[PDB]
Design an enzyme around this catalytic site. Structure first.
Site, mmCIF file in Angstrom:
data_model
loop_
_atom_site.group_PDB
_atom_site.id
_atom_site.type_symbol
_atom_site.label_atom_id
_atom_site.label_comp_id
_atom_site.label_asym_id
_atom_site.label_seq_id
_atom_site.Cartn_x
_atom_site.Cartn_y
_atom_site.Cartn_z
ATOM 1 N N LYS A 1 -7.234 -21.260 -15.223
ATOM 2 C CA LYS A 1 -6.783 -22.471 -15.902
ATOM 3 C C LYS A 1 -5.310 -22.301 -16.253
ATOM 4 C CE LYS A 1 -5.821 -25.889 -18.338
ATOM 5 N NZ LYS A 1 -6.319 -27.246 -18.689
ATOM 6 N N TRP A 33 -7.055 -26.442 -12.842
ATOM 7 C CA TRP A 33 -7.925 -25.326 -12.495
ATOM 8 C C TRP A 33 -7.770 -25.033 -11.012
ATOM 9 C CZ3 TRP A 33 -8.640 -28.743 -16.222
ATOM 10 C CH2 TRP A 33 -9.150 -28.327 -17.457
ATOM 11 N N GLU A 66 -32.329 -19.731 -10.983
ATOM 12 C CA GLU A 66 -32.785 -20.758 -11.908
ATOM 13 C C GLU A 66 -33.305 -22.013 -11.217
ATOM 14 O OE1 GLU A 66 -29.872 -19.162 -12.152
ATOM 15 O OE2 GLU A 66 -29.585 -18.416 -14.192
#
Ligand SMILES: CCOC(=O)CCCCCC(=O)O
Ligand SMILES: CCOC(=O)CCCCCC(=O)O
Ligand SMILES: CCOC(=O)CCCCCC(=O)O
Lengths: 530, 530, 530
Positions: free
Chosen positions: B429, B434, B319
């Protein structure tokens, strides 16, 4: 403006805040006056944006600057365009009438003028109807710019706008009756920085501007973005040294003490630096200087090479970004001796990335690149001025045929090496041929009693326009026209009529017309002698 | 299109015809099959444009290519975009169903497929309703592409069009049910070339791509423009060596014989090159390789440094151009020993020119750059895909909050060094924190009887989602779960519950789920084990 | 242009071809040089249109004229606008630098210059880059304009275009650093002609311009359309006499021989005509002259009335058409004696038809019309320049508050009689009051040893800016400052501090600064004395 964050706009704020490299502890040095870090530079840019907003500067406004090469000029290169205003760089070497004309034409809202240019302003201040504020710049603590900056916060959210917003403008005095306003957008300046960095950054060994260099401009910042080098140096995050007013000893001391490795200057400045007594005991190894303002003389290039200076020539003008060509040497060309590579380094150069250059005739017919056929250089580039500000006819002539006309006559080698002979307007047209008016000066400068040679053209009946030439006598040298005619006949390797000696009619004149810049005004000579 | 010649458009034809440098006698080398000059390359591009026009390819059409890294691919990088068509680079390593989906989605008009990928086509040819012509590429004289080229003239006037015309497209298989089509315009590719050349060209000593380099890609050209390096190498005019199908001995022989100095590859390819017996007697000095496909292991970087390879890591995705970050070492950092600078060279890197990168939380709040706080990298750059082709919701998620979401969790140093921990979707999580799922694999890979470690997350009642882990036994090693639990307890420097050993529940499984690429499918593991 | 014949456009061609009256045998007289009929005038206009088309003049082009008041100027007033070109009237009394600036600013394509202004052109010809043709006008048979006209046919189909097409432009030198370009459209000029004809044509007895009048301009045609009187005279079909260069004896002889009944001139020209010995034996009955360039002195008006001249004053400027006010006397006012009606006829006048005029303060607050309260005249009219050509800030100041600022301070009677005191910039502001700088000159001109009185303002500490004054001594009159101070004290009917004699500090100076026009430059005096 609706940013459309996926639609990236090429803005100068991205040059400042998305650079190739950023060292917050890297120094911005202003001669011996000031010295701060890149973090402080970034803060001062935000402070200047705040001060300009407080002064009422809006997007589309014009902030004019009359200053030497300083940190303030570097901050003006960024803060004024980044808030959406046009930065008007005033050529302080222009006549006060010309400066006043440019100020009135650009309609500057605020002028940032150094205190040493106040005598210039005092002659034209009464005829300025458009400036609402004068900020006087000083190198001491009494500078009004510094006071305006220190009363503002170092926080600013710079706007996003269209990349085709005009960022900078300045006026060129070429072959027109009035200075011509060229302007550039944020996109054009960003593209100029990227293209020149891709061109000269990717050099194998010679002529590199890289992240380890130390930058000191020796061309004025009111010229064509100082050839775009302040933007490139900021985007590379390199140490930037700004010398202020150009004093050769001050420049030499700055080069020695700050270890300057990359510079740009005109041949006159390079000659003054090389001929200064202080430069004899100076280690010029590691100093790279590009010469673009005028043609680089091969003798000056040879002397600089003897001083171990990586000296090479570049090409550009006010209309073109400026950079269109830079001399780049192959590793085989760097193995040549000093004399052979002084020819290469003093050439106009090869066209830089994203620049397409052609030599054409008066009918815009492209001429072969063979090193002999000469024509006007016509260019297309991402950083050309689209037209002249508030001008139609000169703008139409500048972009005639779909290309920007540089006004320079040149031939291009098979390898792509451009070599400029002379100007289009300074052309001698005889019968069916065009001969340069610049090599004749060097031909006639070889006598022991000639100081300055200027060649001009005037019509004759049978042979059309023919070249006249001007010299001055030396001490106890009362040589008449016959001696100089014989000297011109004494040369060799000349074409047309015998050896180009049948209508020279060389004349001696005590007064030689020189402009304020230092170059002879050929149109003034035409008016005076005819 | 009305060109408005003063309005410059950033086109790939300007990369080809207005380069940084052009040597017409510089070679384009295709392994041991073909070898021609840059003049011949330019002619073959014009011939390919003529052939595409004869085939009926118009502006806006899609020409798909299924090929290895070859001169033909390099010519497709230019001729197809320059005539106004979109170049569709087909990932030949995708499954035939995925390749068929991408072909149907892009609606390719003509497919240039190598004869070795014909078995792939035979499985999906009947379900292609949009391709009117197949050109079979061969390395012998029977190539249909070569025959199509030799029947055309070497003259072509390439059109001028809008710079926002889509030039290239390819499909990414990320975390979606179908491959996602990313596309790039001429302006984006030109800006990517200029920005990366400004970033890595202007390096002082290390990690330079300059005009004297010899380029050999070792990443596929159907990937993200081969990281844009073919365009940069063409614009620099350097010798380009294309190896075809990646055979480690063939690549090593090409590096030795063609004196390859700049390459790009993935860590797997670099490991295969370094572990090959033919590489022991190879002088790797002067060879620079950038590693961007996956995270560069510090051990592999250290071994490459021991082989005197200028090895450094880059970052990007389908991308993003792809390049967003490249590892660039200061001259102080190059004075460190092999172990210290292997850490630096294996880092994600510093954001390249014109790229602004931030780490944010789930609410798009920017996190401090301190080297500890980790969040998703979000970027703005001049070469990001604006959306996914024929997609709205995935496109909206990709550009959520005004920034492109890379899907990578990272922390950024004060100096700007980005270090990616793991992916956003591959995140564990627990309660309020995290933890990465990738460093656990390295922690649990230190046993004498562990081969491959994969960490996955599944919910638990009191502690939320907790991490499970998978290993394989060795020969005559019937260690149960208790031994591996004790080994995990035997480590040090772990937070949360004691030493992060209370619910490991490590399990041994004979079969480890691997995709065709070589990376473990975490979603497939989630589906299989739950 | 799509005419839409039902959609009438107000064009100057309709002034020429749809007049109030047309007598084809009515004469157009150019002094003693040329004399032809209105039919010949119409034919010569068509011939000039043909010649301009042959020269390459297109719609939107600028044809500049440097000429005296002649038939050629009258033909330029029509033919150049009617073919769609802008007529640039060059003020030949400006300095050559100013004329060159205006030529460059307007970008004139062709200049019609009289042979007597060739010395002016020779100083600035080299700095003109925009003129492709010079037509030299002569009063003999060698005129290039006449030769260009006689080679063309007397048939021309004049185009229809938008009535807002700019027809005329000229430059004003006011209180700016450079001349300001004002421009007018066909609609504005047609409306000016109609409005002034409705205003002064419908006079009962006095001050009529009717169809039986004989018109001779004595104001330059390069000024504001010669106050629009050539257009009105052509539209009335009256005999038009053009005198060329203004020689008082030539003008008097033309008035006598051609029986001139309507004229317009400045007070200086009227004084020269009345003081000439040739005028003593002249019957001035039936001659009507309007005085608009400067304020008409009551003594000059009284002398003209004693010569039985219908003398009345008008008001206007370059920006305003020009006409905004004309003195119109009621039948009761015509019964007053010479002294009483000399006051009325020397007034600024009453606003003409379609003109709304107000006097405002610095905040654009309208002041009562009582004959005492004074403020800047602000006007709206159908023939005002919308802005200055290629100017933004001066244009914004000119139309500040929604009205055109005339720069003149005046009071308005209850009956509507405007009386201008002085200029806005030439205003003396003391504490809280504004006093005129012009009546002080008349107050201090009453001594037996004063020649010219100029009043200027400079700041003082307690009383703000205070007025200084300048006079010259006479023969054998060595009066010091004390005598003039006593003379100023010897007057009566003065306000503020006692009798306005506490800080006069009158000073004698041998040199009095006068511009080329004949009016003292107040800004030059400010710069010189401070
Ligand atoms: C490669 C650097 O050289 C240049 O760009 C030359 C620019 C000169 C512009 C004209 C002037 O300022 O006198
Ligand atoms: C600096 C060069 O490194 C890169 O740009 C990394 C690009 C990897 C894109 C994803 C893939 O192709 O697997
Ligand atoms: C009624 C006629 O009087 C006027 O219109 C006055 C115009 C004066 C313009 C300024 C000048 O030309 O000096």
């Amino acid at each position: 403006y609706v940013n459309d964050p996926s639609n990236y706009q090429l803005l100068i704020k991205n040059l400042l805040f998305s650079p190739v490299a950023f060292n917050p502890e890297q120094e911005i040095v202003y001669a011996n006056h000031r010295r701060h870090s890149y973090k402080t530079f970034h803060d001062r840019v935000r402070q200047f944006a705040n001060a300009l907003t407080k002064m009422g500067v809006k997007k589309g406004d014009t902030v004019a600057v009359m200053d030497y090469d300083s940190h303030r000029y570097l901050e003006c290169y960024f803060a004024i365009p980044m808030i959406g205003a046009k930065l008007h760089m005033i050529n302080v070497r222009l006549s006060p009438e010309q400066i006043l004309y440019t100020i009135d034409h650009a309609e500057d809202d605020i002028i940032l003028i150094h205190e040493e240019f106040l005598p210039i302003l005092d002659q034209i201040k009464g005829r300025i109807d458009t400036v609402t504020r004068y900020v006087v710049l000083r190198d001491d603590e009494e500078c009004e710019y510094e006071r305006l900056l220190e009363q503002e916060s170092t926080e600013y959210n710079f706007p996003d706008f269209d990349e085709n917003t005009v960022a900078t403008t300045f006026y060129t005095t070429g072959t027109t009756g009035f200075p011509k306003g060229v302007f550039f957008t944020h996109r054009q300046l960003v593209l100029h920085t990227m293209g020149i960095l891709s061109t000269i950054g990717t050099n194998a060994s010679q002529g590199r501007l890289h992240q380890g260099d130390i930058y000191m401009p020796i061309t004025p910042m009111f010229h064509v973005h100082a050839w775009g080098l302040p933007y490139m140096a900021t985007m590379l995050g390199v140490k930037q040294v700004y010398p202020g007013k150009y004093v050769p000893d001050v420049l030499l001391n700055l080069i020695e003490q700050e270890k300057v490795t990359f510079s740009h200057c005109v041949p006159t400045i390079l000659h003054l630096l090389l001929s200064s007594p202080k430069s004899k005991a100076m280690d010029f190894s590691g100093w790279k200087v590009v010469i673009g303002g005028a043609a680089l003389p091969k003798a000056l290039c040879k002397s600089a090479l003897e001083r171990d200076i990586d000296v090479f020539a570049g090409y550009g003008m006010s209309e073109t970004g400026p950079i269109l060509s830079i001399v780049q040497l192959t590793p085989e060309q760097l193995e040549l001796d000093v004399d052979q590579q002084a020819e290469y380094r003093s050439k106009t150069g090869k066209k830089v990335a994203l620049v397409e250059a052609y030599i054409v005739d008066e009918d815009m017919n492209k001429l072969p690149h063979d090193g002999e056929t000469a024509g006007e250089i016509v260019v297309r580039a991402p950083w050309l001025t689209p037209n002249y500000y508030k001008d139609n006819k000169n703008s139409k002539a500048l972009w005639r045929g779909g290309y920007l006309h540089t006004g320079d006559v040149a031939h291009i080698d098979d390898e792509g090496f451009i070599k400029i002979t002379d100007r289009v307007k300074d052309m001698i047209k005889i019968s069916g041929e065009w001969v340069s008016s610049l090599e004749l000066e060097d031909i006639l400068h070889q006598h022991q009693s000639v100081s300055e040679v200027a060649v001009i053209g005037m019509p004759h009946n049978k042979w059309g326009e023919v070249p006249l030439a001007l010299v001055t006598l030396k001490e106890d040298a009362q040589v008449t026209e016959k001696e100089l005619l014989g000297f011109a006949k004494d040369f060799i390797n000349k074409g047309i009529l015998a050896r180009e000696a049948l209508l020279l009619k060389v004349k001696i004149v005590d007064e030689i017309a020189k402009t304020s810049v230092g170059k002879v005004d050929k149109k003034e000579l035409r008016k005076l002698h005819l």
